[PDB]
């Protein structure tokens, strides 16, 4: 039955007289377009761009009465170029900065025709999606990024989107592994959105990203913390060694701003102060005061033999107050952003 | 016949014999093209390139007598692949550097006919537009970036552009988010421009962008101010501590030189001094003048009771003269560029 010539003259009677210009059941009820996604990978997430790049397989289902056929048991699979001769819903991603269908060998498109007219149409995409982020807690933040899927031309009177299978409609998300982030949760939505031209259908896919703190421990905190500890060595060197305690202090100032410059490029030029900015400036103040302490001591030792005791006394209290204050500040910082 | 067949026969009857080579109502009065814009976002603004990137929904609306149809009450929404077979205005953006129409799934275009022949036509576009920026007042500046819209092929004897809806013709300006800037207002223009080949219609969209100062306070001014204040420590340390007086003095001067030179890679090569450059140069003169102060304390102390008295008098004044002069300088700076 399924001889080659029979299949040809079956398909040709579907295409001959077909009109790409009109949606299925035009004038009638809306076309129900079922969506389905498989996330292949999330390439990267970038704050400086406020974007993340996504690679996925993307599928769509609908019924087109004009493409029903009988006498062939198969679910026919056709060369992808039939896509240029059929109707397809004009879905597009709102928040993409750049997108393209992969073109290796042949443009990665798929069409499969079932006997009852149910078309399945899908393609492989890499898309750079915009996602601006709440950097008010940068080292300890928790972001929400989404992909908005919407139809461009047709209103709700013509097309309805719905997730095929509900919670099962997107797969492979739990298999993703970002270096800087972990996928805490993902959730789905279906809703109408109304513009001046009418109501438009929408689906949206959303992720929640929580950052892996481990990076900053190596590159941000320990380096700055131990410089702060090093700056306290001034309190233990004898106060008569002016050439040493000043050089020690100013070098830590240079080192502290050196870390700051190597944090200049990694982040966007955001107006408000970030948690990392608060910490680095806090350490800079500790180093800055630790240097001013000598000036206060040197002035007192020479703005006169009891002053030999005054310099020792100020060193003895600074020997305690600075480490104690820094520990209190550090404890408040971590417990603030963890609890509050 | 039937609600399917009747529409198909109508569409074919419209386009059979249609001629895309000629504008609507050729040879009669000009065909008025109404248009409006909905902004999606401004992706970035770059001093280094003197440009900004805009993403928008761009729409057009014009009469064409040849596309009228009767007996159908619906506003036909044909598939977007019709656009290759109709006439469309040759509208274009004059200050465009690089730009494209998004092509995910299907190239983002819309068409919506009406019974009396009026057509609505739209695109989703991302455009990188050149913008000349007056950096003399940077970072306290405000910039007027614009998009210049024009018809290329047709003179004003054939085409007329008008903002559809007047003041409301552009929407979504308040969904523009930029870390560096905030929109003060947007204003619309309509004009006729003249070139050697005729007079052409023009429409313009303009934004008054005001910069946010938060970043530069946090990361540019304060590091300079603290280095300047650090440079006053010398006045409190003993004049006999020559090694400490110097090593810190040339360190602050060295740091100021580093700040002045290494920040400029983030912004374009410009021939005139910018406001913040004047500040970093101004604060630099203070720290160098402070270092010269010590040099002449050492000179009078060693090389020329005067050896004690005159050295003490100069050093004692500097503890109040430099801070007073710096505050006066700082006050004048922040009054000038804010007030005049």
């Amino acid at each position, epitope marked *: 039955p399924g001889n080659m010539s029979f299949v040809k003259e079956t398909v040709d009677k579907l295409l001959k007289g077909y009109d790409i210009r009109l949606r299925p059941d035009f004038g009638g009820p809306p076309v129900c377009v079922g969506m389905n996604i498989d996330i292949a990978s999330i390439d990267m997430v970038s704050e400086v761009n406020m974007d993340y790049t996504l690679t996925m397989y993307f599928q769509q289902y609908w019924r087109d009465k004009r493409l029903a056929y009988s006498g062939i048991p198969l679910n026919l699979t056709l060369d992808n170029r039939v896509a240029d001769q059929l109707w397809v819903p004009d879905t597009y991603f709102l928040n993409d900065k750049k997108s393209f269908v992969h073109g290796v060998t042949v443009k990665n498109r798929m069409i499969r025709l079932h006997p009852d007219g149910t078309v399945l149409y899908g393609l492989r995409i890499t898309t750079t999606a915009a996602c601006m982020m*709440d950097l008010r807690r940068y080292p300890l933040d928790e972001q929400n990024c*989404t992909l*908005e899927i919407e139809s461009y031309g047709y209103t709700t009177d013509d097309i309805e989107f719905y997730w095929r299978g509900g919670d099962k409609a997107v797969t492979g998300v739990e298999r993703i592994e970002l270096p800087q982030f972990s996928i805490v949760e993902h959730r789905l939505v279906s809703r*109408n*959105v*109304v513009f*001046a031209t009418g109501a438009y259908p929408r689906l949206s896919l959303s992720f929640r990203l929580k950052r892996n703190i481990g990076y900053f421990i190596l590159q941000t905190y320990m380096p700055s913390i131990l410089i702060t500890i090093l700056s306290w060595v001034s309190f233990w060197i004898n106060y008569d060694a002016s050439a040493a305690r000043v050089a020690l202090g100013i070098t830590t100032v240079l080192t502290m701003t050196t870390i700051n410059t190597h944090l200049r490029e990694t982040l966007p030029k955001i107006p408000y102060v970030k948690a990392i900015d608060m910490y680095l400036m806090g350490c800079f103040v500790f180093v800055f005061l630790a240097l001013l302490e000598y000036a206060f001591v040197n002035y007192i030792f020479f703005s006169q033999e009891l002053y030999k005791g005054r310099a020792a006394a100020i060193d003895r209290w600074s020997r305690i107050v600075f480490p104690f204050t820094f520990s209190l500040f550090n404890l408040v910082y971590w417990l603030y952003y963890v609890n509050s | 016949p039937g609600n399917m067949s009747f529409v198909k026969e109508t569409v074919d009857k419209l386009l059979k014999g249609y001629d895309i080579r000629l504008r609507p109502d050729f040879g009669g009065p000009p065909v008025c093209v109404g248009m409006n814009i909905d902004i999606a976002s401004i992706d970035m603004v770059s001093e280094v390139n003197m440009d900004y990137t805009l993403t928008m929904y761009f729409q057009q609306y014009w009469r064409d007598k040849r596309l009228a149809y009767s007996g159908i009450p619906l506003n036909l929404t044909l598939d977007n692949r019709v656009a290759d077979q109709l006439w469309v205005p040759d509208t274009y953006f004059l200050n465009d550097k690089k730009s494209f129409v998004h092509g995910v799934t299907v190239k983002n275009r819309m068409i919506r006919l009406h019974p009396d022949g009026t057509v609505l036509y739209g695109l989703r576009i991302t455009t990188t537009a050149a913008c000349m920026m007056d950096l003399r007042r940077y970072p306290l500046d405000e910039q007027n970036c614009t998009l210049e819209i024009e018809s290329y092929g047709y003179t004003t004897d054939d085409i007329e552009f008008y903002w559809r809806g007047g003041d409301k013709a552009v929407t979504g300006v*308040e969904r523009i988010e930029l870390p560096q800037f905030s929109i003060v207002e947007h204003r619309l223009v309509s004009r006729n421009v003249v070139f050697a080949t005729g007079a052409y219609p023009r429409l313009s969209l303009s934004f008054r962008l005001k910069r946010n100062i938060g970043y530069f306070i946090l990361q540019t001014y304060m590091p300079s101010i603290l280095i300047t204040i650090l440079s006053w420590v010398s006045f409190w340390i003993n004049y006999d501590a020559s090694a400490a007086r110097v090593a810190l003095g040339i360190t602050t001067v060295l740091t100021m030189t580093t700040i002045n030179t290494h920040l400029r890679e983030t912004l374009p090569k410009i021939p005139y001094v910018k406001a913040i450059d004047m500040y970093l140069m101004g604060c630099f003169v203070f720290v160098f003048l402070a270092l010269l102060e010590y040099a002449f304390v050492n000179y009078i102390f060693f090389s020329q009771e005067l050896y004690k008295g005159r050295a003490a008098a100069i050093d004692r004044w500097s503890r109040i003269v430099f801070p007073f002069t710096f505050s006066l300088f700082n006050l004048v700076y922040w009054l000038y560029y804010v007030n005049s």
Partner: nanobody
Amino acid sequence: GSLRLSCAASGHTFNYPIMGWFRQAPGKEREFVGAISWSGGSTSYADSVKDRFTISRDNAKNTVYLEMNNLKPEDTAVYYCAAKGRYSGGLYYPTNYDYWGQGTQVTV
């Protein structure tokens, strides 16, 4: 006369950068009044209230203020506060707004 209405928000407001005011009167559909963009300060108003009402914000207190200046009898209505998603559609249509206030009342 004049009144001042205010709307306070708590939680993850950064996901909803735009907030607006909508008013309703007996025997009528819900109207648009105005909107505010968090951290941007830009605003737009309906023609019936243009230059009579103004809207402002306090980002630290997380509140939006609507200065309801120069009242007229036609302004009698309840004035719901509402929030809007970042990527939702046009401002003028209430169906785009997700979370809503309790519906304070004004009388004129």
